[PDB]
A paper describes a structure:
Here, we report a general and rapid method for discovering α-helically constrained (Helicon) polypeptides that cooperatively induce the interaction between two target proteins without relying on previously known binders or an intrinsic affinity between the proteins. We show that Helicons are capable of binding every major class of E3 ubiquitin ligases, which are of great biological and therapeutic interest but remain largely intractable to targeting by small molecules. In addition to possessing increased stability and membrane permeability, Helicons are capable of binding large, flat protein surfaces that are inaccessible to targeting by small molecules, and Helicons have been developed to target a range of PPI targets in cells and in vivo. Characterizing Helicon-E3 co-structures and mechanisms of action, we identified new binding sites for α-helices on the E3 surfaces, as well as potential probes of the disease-linked E3, WWP123,24, highlighting the generality of our approach against this therapeutically important target class.
We also included the corresponding CRL substrate-recognition adapters, including VHL and the ElonginB/ElonginC complex (ELOBC) for CUL2. We identified Helicon hits forming VHL-ELOBC-specific clusters and CUL5-specific clusters. Using SPR, we confirmed the specificity of H313 for VHL-ELOBC over SOCS2-ELOBC and measured the KD for the former to be 4.1 μM. We further characterized by x-ray crystallography Helicons derived from these screens. We solved the structure of H314 with the CUL5 N-terminal domain (CUL5NTD) at ~2.8 Å resolution, H313 in complex with VHL-ELOBC at ~3.5 Å resolution, and CUL4B-specific H316 from C77 in complex with the N-terminal domain of CUL4B (CUL4BNTD) at ~2.9 Å resolution. Meanwhile, H313 binds at a novel VHL site that is distinct from and adjacent to the HXC78-binding site, which to our knowledge was the only known VHL ligand-binding site prior to this work. For instance, both the H314-binding site on CUL5 and the H313-binding site on VHL face the Ub-E2 binding sites of the cognate Cullin CTDs, providing a potentially ideal configuration for TPD applications, where both the E3 binding site and the ‘linkerology’ of heterobifunctional molecules is critically important to optimize ternary complex formation and the geometry of the E2- and E3-catalyzed reactions.
Numbering used by the authors:
A (entry chain A): 1 to 108
B (entry chain B): 17 to 49, 58 to 112
C (entry chain G): 1 to 17
D (entry chain C): 58 to 208
Write the structure that this text describes.
Amino acid sequence: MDVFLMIRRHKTTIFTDAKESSTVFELKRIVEGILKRPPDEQRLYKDDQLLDDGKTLGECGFTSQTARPQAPATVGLAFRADDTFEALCIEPFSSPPELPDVMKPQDS
Amino acid sequence: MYVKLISSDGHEFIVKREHALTSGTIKAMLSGPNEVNFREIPSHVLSKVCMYFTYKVRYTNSSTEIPEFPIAPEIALELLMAANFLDC
Amino acid sequence: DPAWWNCFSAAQQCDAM
Amino acid sequence: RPRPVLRSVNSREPSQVIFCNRSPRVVLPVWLNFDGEPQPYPTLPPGTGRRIHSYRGHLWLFRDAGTHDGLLVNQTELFVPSLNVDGQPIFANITLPVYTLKERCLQVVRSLVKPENYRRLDIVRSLYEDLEDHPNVQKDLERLTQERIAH
Ligand SMILES: *CC(=O)Nc1ccc(NC(=O)C*)cc1
């Protein structure tokens, strides 16, 4: 019922939640209240498929079993540069270092 | 109301205020003389920390079946030090 | 109140008359 | 000061009880005898149930069978059987608590490194002590008793 999201663009990561019976345009309103940009200047993406304004989050593929709290689903975002939208980019996170010599399984 | 939490490597995490006020340490950094920098917390840790905020706000008091909060071993050592420092 | 809050308090009063 | 008070009465009145394990851990049901001492009982696999013949007015606490991590039952610490009104067995839905992220991270690390390597980790000083301070039932009963005394 409740879906939890990570709206991401480049280095920006937004954490919010909506309901399955809420549309993508309604989610673009949520970003408008945050990043101060209108929906027609936003393009939301599941991975790399462009989600149109008319469909609900559950219909786009954000079911409650995938858009959970402890593991929220990434929602791609791209803004309009001048008159043409940017290329959908989400800068990856930092990588963790090598697992120490002790924390390894080791059992023969 | 939304606040912004920055990682050392330069990621910008925007979460609700009641979510950020889960950490007692963060309550004080923005109590008043918002935006916060964490110069020893990378992005892969601060992101998981932000997930715990949503995890606690959601499942505290809730009579539902509470699921495990997952932590990968490679980030377990770093997430612990941040959890100690961030107090949450 | 939880069911064991009464379980505690009833013991304290009974045990320590 | 004399007798510990987290204890069960010998009410001799039977009571149907069902433990449900709505947690991914292997739950260890624990009954406090009439003297406050905890009696362990056979473990519960995750997602499983079990009817249990306990008695009206007993006390039950549940922990992780391997790590002794604390668990909630019916959203609270301890469980008290009672009358079975019209057939009705009493449900003891064992659940996880919303752990503090610190205690949760210790839970993971304690399951990867094993005692003698707790001090082989390059972490801050007051964390080896937290790692070595494992979840204890006997001490959490002292805490649970001391908490409500002020109320
Ligand atoms: C669950 C419960 O009822 N515990 C309980 C109640 C009363 C007493 N008092 C005496 O035994 C004298 C102990 C435990």
